[PDB]
Tab-separated table of C-alpha atoms in Angstrom:
chain	number	residue	atom	x	y	z
A	261	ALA	CA	0.000	0.000	0.000
A	262	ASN	CA	0.952	3.661	-0.621
A	263	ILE	CA	-0.156	7.029	0.894
A	264	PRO	CA	0.995	9.686	-1.669
A	265	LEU	CA	2.377	13.096	-0.582
A	266	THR	CA	-0.315	14.971	1.389
A	267	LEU	CA	-0.728	18.097	3.550
A	268	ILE	CA	-1.557	17.904	7.282
A	269	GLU	CA	-2.941	21.090	8.943
A	270	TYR	CA	-4.270	19.934	12.373
A	271	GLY	CA	-3.207	18.274	15.641
A	272	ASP	CA	0.421	17.320	16.404
A	273	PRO	CA	1.578	14.672	13.869
A	274	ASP	CA	5.219	14.499	15.111
A	275	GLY	CA	5.329	15.481	18.848
A	276	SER	CA	6.744	19.055	18.551
A	277	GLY	CA	3.451	20.927	19.368
A	278	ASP	CA	0.106	21.525	17.618
A	279	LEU	CA	0.078	22.819	13.977
A	280	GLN	CA	-2.747	25.302	14.672
A	281	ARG	CA	-1.160	26.396	18.003
A	282	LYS	CA	2.338	27.016	16.545
A	283	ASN	CA	0.986	28.036	13.127
A	284	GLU	CA	2.717	25.459	10.905
A	285	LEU	CA	2.041	22.921	8.159
A	286	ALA	CA	3.392	19.401	7.644
A	287	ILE	CA	3.718	17.315	4.455
A	288	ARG	CA	3.726	13.495	4.790
A	289	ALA	CA	4.234	10.479	2.519
A	290	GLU	CA	4.032	6.735	3.373
A	291	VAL	CA	4.628	3.387	1.704
A	292	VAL	CA	4.435	-0.184	3.031
A	293	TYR	CA	6.789	-2.817	1.594
A	294	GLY	CA	6.567	-6.566	2.005
A	295	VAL	CA	10.132	-8.018	2.083
A	296	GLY	CA	11.552	-11.572	2.141
A	297	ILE	CA	14.762	-13.526	1.507
A	298	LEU	CA	14.190	-17.066	0.145
A	299	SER	CA	17.759	-18.060	1.144
A	300	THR	CA	20.644	-15.997	2.559
A	301	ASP	CA	23.087	-18.200	0.537
A	302	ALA	CA	21.733	-16.645	-2.689
A	303	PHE	CA	23.897	-13.613	-1.716
A	304	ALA	CA	27.565	-12.930	-0.968
A	305	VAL	CA	29.217	-9.747	0.427
A	306	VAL	CA	32.561	-8.023	-0.169
A	307	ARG	CA	33.590	-6.490	3.162
A	308	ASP	CA	36.469	-4.893	5.099
A	309	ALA	CA	35.889	-5.540	8.809
B	53	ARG	CA	-20.783	1.575	24.511
B	54	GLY	CA	-22.191	5.115	24.703
B	55	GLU	CA	-20.868	7.581	27.334
B	56	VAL	CA	-22.862	10.413	28.993
B	57	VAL	CA	-20.857	13.705	28.948
B	58	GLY	CA	-21.103	17.333	30.168
B	59	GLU	CA	-20.664	20.490	28.077
B	60	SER	CA	-16.838	20.737	27.891
B	61	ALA	CA	-16.220	17.398	29.672
B	62	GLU	CA	-13.476	15.087	28.289
B	63	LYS	CA	-14.775	12.261	26.003
B	64	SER	CA	-13.645	8.583	26.172
B	65	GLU	CA	-13.438	5.682	23.643
B	66	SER	CA	-15.050	2.217	23.765
B	67	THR	CA	-14.478	-0.005	20.738
B	68	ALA	CA	-15.677	-3.359	19.415
B	69	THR	CA	-13.362	-6.320	20.153
B	70	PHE	CA	-13.137	-9.365	17.879
B	71	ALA	CA	-11.575	-12.833	17.972
B	72	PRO	CA	-11.200	-15.704	15.453
B	73	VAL	CA	-12.476	-19.284	15.929
B	74	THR	CA	-11.245	-22.238	13.810
B	75	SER	CA	-12.542	-25.568	12.439
B	76	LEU	CA	-10.941	-28.982	12.870
B	77	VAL	CA	-10.750	-31.482	9.974
B	78	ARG	CA	-11.896	-35.100	10.585
B	79	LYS	CA	-11.329	-37.921	8.068
B	80	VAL	CA	-13.677	-40.891	8.614
B	81	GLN	CA	-13.287	-44.268	6.896
B	82	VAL	CA	-15.185	-47.570	6.887
B	83	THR	CA	-13.483	-50.829	5.769
B	84	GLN	CA	-15.375	-54.162	5.475
B	85	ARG	CA	-13.348	-57.405	4.914
B	86	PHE	CA	-14.772	-60.707	3.505
B	87	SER	CA	-13.568	-64.031	1.927
B	88	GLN	CA	-13.711	-64.509	-1.881
B	89	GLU	CA	-15.941	-67.495	-0.944
B	90	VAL	CA	-18.602	-64.874	0.056
B	91	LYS	CA	-18.344	-63.125	-3.344
B	92	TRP	CA	-18.827	-66.505	-5.101
B	93	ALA	CA	-21.742	-67.486	-2.827
B	94	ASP	CA	-23.542	-64.150	-3.322
B	95	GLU	CA	-22.993	-63.879	-7.115
B	96	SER	CA	-24.161	-67.501	-7.663
B	97	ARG	CA	-27.159	-67.594	-5.236
B	98	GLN	CA	-28.105	-63.851	-5.553
B	99	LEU	CA	-28.096	-63.139	-1.757
B	100	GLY	CA	-27.569	-59.339	-2.025
B	101	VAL	CA	-24.997	-59.472	0.829
B	102	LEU	CA	-22.507	-57.301	-1.116
B	103	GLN	CA	-25.240	-54.758	-2.009
B	104	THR	CA	-26.481	-54.507	1.613
C	261	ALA	CA	-1.502	37.975	3.234
C	262	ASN	CA	-5.002	37.307	4.604
C	263	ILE	CA	-6.732	34.222	6.122
C	264	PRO	CA	-10.493	35.078	6.250
C	265	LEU	CA	-12.651	33.903	9.201
C	266	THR	CA	-12.548	30.083	9.497
C	267	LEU	CA	-13.733	27.235	11.756
C	268	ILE	CA	-11.138	24.961	13.447
C	269	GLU	CA	-12.544	21.564	14.566
C	270	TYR	CA	-9.411	19.498	15.467
C	271	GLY	CA	-6.320	19.626	17.682
C	272	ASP	CA	-5.743	22.366	20.267
C	273	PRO	CA	-5.278	25.803	18.614
C	274	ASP	CA	-4.892	27.752	21.924
C	275	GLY	CA	-3.666	25.355	24.704
C	276	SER	CA	-6.983	24.711	26.589
C	277	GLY	CA	-7.296	21.024	25.467
C	278	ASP	CA	-8.231	19.142	22.287
C	279	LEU	CA	-11.347	20.361	20.396
C	280	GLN	CA	-12.530	16.797	19.684
C	281	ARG	CA	-11.712	15.641	23.258
C	282	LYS	CA	-13.661	18.471	24.980
C	283	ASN	CA	-16.267	18.776	22.158
C	284	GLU	CA	-15.565	22.437	21.428
C	285	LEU	CA	-15.143	24.589	18.331
C	286	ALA	CA	-12.897	27.552	17.597
C	287	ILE	CA	-13.072	30.359	15.023
C	288	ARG	CA	-9.917	32.081	13.756
C	289	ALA	CA	-9.226	35.124	11.629
C	290	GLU	CA	-5.735	36.261	10.733
C	291	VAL	CA	-3.993	38.956	8.669
C	292	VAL	CA	-0.377	40.043	8.201
C	293	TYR	CA	0.395	43.755	7.826
C	294	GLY	CA	3.556	45.356	6.463
C	295	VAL	CA	4.161	48.700	8.295
C	296	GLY	CA	6.820	51.442	7.944
C	297	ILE	CA	7.102	55.206	8.632
C	298	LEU	CA	9.122	57.241	6.090
C	299	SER	CA	9.899	60.024	8.555
C	300	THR	CA	8.739	60.494	12.132
C	301	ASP	CA	8.891	64.287	11.421
C	302	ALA	CA	5.858	63.877	9.092
C	303	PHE	CA	3.763	63.625	12.319
C	304	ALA	CA	3.024	65.709	15.397
C	305	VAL	CA	1.093	64.705	18.557
C	306	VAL	CA	-1.049	66.568	21.077
C	307	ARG	CA	-0.815	65.020	24.562
C	308	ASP	CA	-0.964	65.602	28.347
C	309	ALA	CA	1.968	64.346	30.470
Protein backbone atom coordinates (compact mmCIF):
# COMPACT_ATOMS: atom_id res chain seq x y z
CA ALA A 1 0.00 0.00 0.00
CA ASN A 2 0.95 3.66 -0.62
CA ILE A 3 -0.16 7.03 0.89
CA PRO A 4 1.00 9.69 -1.67
CA LEU A 5 2.38 13.10 -0.58
CA THR A 6 -0.32 14.97 1.39
CA LEU A 7 -0.73 18.10 3.55
CA ILE A 8 -1.56 17.90 7.28
CA GLU A 9 -2.94 21.09 8.94
CA TYR A 10 -4.27 19.93 12.37
CA GLY A 11 -3.21 18.27 15.64
CA ASP A 12 0.42 17.32 16.40
CA PRO A 13 1.58 14.67 13.87
CA ASP A 14 5.22 14.50 15.11
CA GLY A 15 5.33 15.48 18.85
CA SER A 16 6.74 19.06 18.55
CA GLY A 17 3.45 20.93 19.37
CA ASP A 18 0.11 21.52 17.62
CA LEU A 19 0.08 22.82 13.98
CA GLN A 20 -2.75 25.30 14.67
CA ARG A 21 -1.16 26.40 18.00
CA LYS A 22 2.34 27.02 16.55
CA ASN A 23 0.99 28.04 13.13
CA GLU A 24 2.72 25.46 10.91
CA LEU A 25 2.04 22.92 8.16
CA ALA A 26 3.39 19.40 7.64
CA ILE A 27 3.72 17.31 4.45
CA ARG A 28 3.73 13.49 4.79
CA ALA A 29 4.23 10.48 2.52
CA GLU A 30 4.03 6.73 3.37
CA VAL A 31 4.63 3.39 1.70
CA VAL A 32 4.43 -0.18 3.03
CA TYR A 33 6.79 -2.82 1.59
CA GLY A 34 6.57 -6.57 2.01
CA VAL A 35 10.13 -8.02 2.08
CA GLY A 36 11.55 -11.57 2.14
CA ILE A 37 14.76 -13.53 1.51
CA LEU A 38 14.19 -17.07 0.14
CA SER A 39 17.76 -18.06 1.14
CA THR A 40 20.64 -16.00 2.56
CA ASP A 41 23.09 -18.20 0.54
CA ALA A 42 21.73 -16.65 -2.69
CA PHE A 43 23.90 -13.61 -1.72
CA ALA A 44 27.56 -12.93 -0.97
CA VAL A 45 29.22 -9.75 0.43
CA VAL A 46 32.56 -8.02 -0.17
CA ARG A 47 33.59 -6.49 3.16
CA ASP A 48 36.47 -4.89 5.10
CA ALA A 49 35.89 -5.54 8.81
CA ARG B 1 -20.78 1.58 24.51
CA GLY B 2 -22.19 5.11 24.70
CA GLU B 3 -20.87 7.58 27.33
CA VAL B 4 -22.86 10.41 28.99
CA VAL B 5 -20.86 13.71 28.95
CA GLY B 6 -21.10 17.33 30.17
CA GLU B 7 -20.66 20.49 28.08
CA SER B 8 -16.84 20.74 27.89
CA ALA B 9 -16.22 17.40 29.67
CA GLU B 10 -13.48 15.09 28.29
CA LYS B 11 -14.77 12.26 26.00
CA SER B 12 -13.65 8.58 26.17
CA GLU B 13 -13.44 5.68 23.64
CA SER B 14 -15.05 2.22 23.76
CA THR B 15 -14.48 0.00 20.74
CA ALA B 16 -15.68 -3.36 19.41
CA THR B 17 -13.36 -6.32 20.15
CA PHE B 18 -13.14 -9.37 17.88
CA ALA B 19 -11.57 -12.83 17.97
CA PRO B 20 -11.20 -15.70 15.45
CA VAL B 21 -12.48 -19.28 15.93
CA THR B 22 -11.24 -22.24 13.81
CA SER B 23 -12.54 -25.57 12.44
CA LEU B 24 -10.94 -28.98 12.87
CA VAL B 25 -10.75 -31.48 9.97
CA ARG B 26 -11.90 -35.10 10.59
CA LYS B 27 -11.33 -37.92 8.07
CA VAL B 28 -13.68 -40.89 8.61
CA GLN B 29 -13.29 -44.27 6.90
CA VAL B 30 -15.18 -47.57 6.89
CA THR B 31 -13.48 -50.83 5.77
CA GLN B 32 -15.38 -54.16 5.48
CA ARG B 33 -13.35 -57.40 4.91
CA PHE B 34 -14.77 -60.71 3.51
CA SER B 35 -13.57 -64.03 1.93
CA GLN B 36 -13.71 -64.51 -1.88
CA GLU B 37 -15.94 -67.49 -0.94
CA VAL B 38 -18.60 -64.87 0.06
CA LYS B 39 -18.34 -63.12 -3.34
CA TRP B 40 -18.83 -66.51 -5.10
CA ALA B 41 -21.74 -67.49 -2.83
CA ASP B 42 -23.54 -64.15 -3.32
CA GLU B 43 -22.99 -63.88 -7.12
CA SER B 44 -24.16 -67.50 -7.66
CA ARG B 45 -27.16 -67.59 -5.24
CA GLN B 46 -28.11 -63.85 -5.55
CA LEU B 47 -28.10 -63.14 -1.76
CA GLY B 48 -27.57 -59.34 -2.03
CA VAL B 49 -25.00 -59.47 0.83
CA LEU B 50 -22.51 -57.30 -1.12
CA GLN B 51 -25.24 -54.76 -2.01
CA THR B 52 -26.48 -54.51 1.61
CA ALA C 1 -1.50 37.97 3.23
CA ASN C 2 -5.00 37.31 4.60
CA ILE C 3 -6.73 34.22 6.12
CA PRO C 4 -10.49 35.08 6.25
CA LEU C 5 -12.65 33.90 9.20
CA THR C 6 -12.55 30.08 9.50
CA LEU C 7 -13.73 27.23 11.76
CA ILE C 8 -11.14 24.96 13.45
CA GLU C 9 -12.54 21.56 14.57
CA TYR C 10 -9.41 19.50 15.47
CA GLY C 11 -6.32 19.63 17.68
CA ASP C 12 -5.74 22.37 20.27
CA PRO C 13 -5.28 25.80 18.61
CA ASP C 14 -4.89 27.75 21.92
CA GLY C 15 -3.67 25.35 24.70
CA SER C 16 -6.98 24.71 26.59
CA GLY C 17 -7.30 21.02 25.47
CA ASP C 18 -8.23 19.14 22.29
CA LEU C 19 -11.35 20.36 20.40
CA GLN C 20 -12.53 16.80 19.68
CA ARG C 21 -11.71 15.64 23.26
CA LYS C 22 -13.66 18.47 24.98
CA ASN C 23 -16.27 18.78 22.16
CA GLU C 24 -15.57 22.44 21.43
CA LEU C 25 -15.14 24.59 18.33
CA ALA C 26 -12.90 27.55 17.60
CA ILE C 27 -13.07 30.36 15.02
CA ARG C 28 -9.92 32.08 13.76
CA ALA C 29 -9.23 35.12 11.63
CA GLU C 30 -5.74 36.26 10.73
CA VAL C 31 -3.99 38.96 8.67
CA VAL C 32 -0.38 40.04 8.20
CA TYR C 33 0.40 43.75 7.83
CA GLY C 34 3.56 45.36 6.46
CA VAL C 35 4.16 48.70 8.29
CA GLY C 36 6.82 51.44 7.94
CA ILE C 37 7.10 55.21 8.63
CA LEU C 38 9.12 57.24 6.09
CA SER C 39 9.90 60.02 8.55
CA THR C 40 8.74 60.49 12.13
CA ASP C 41 8.89 64.29 11.42
CA ALA C 42 5.86 63.88 9.09
CA PHE C 43 3.76 63.63 12.32
CA ALA C 44 3.02 65.71 15.40
CA VAL C 45 1.09 64.71 18.56
CA VAL C 46 -1.05 66.57 21.08
CA ARG C 47 -0.81 65.02 24.56
CA ASP C 48 -0.96 65.60 28.35
CA ALA C 49 1.97 64.35 30.47
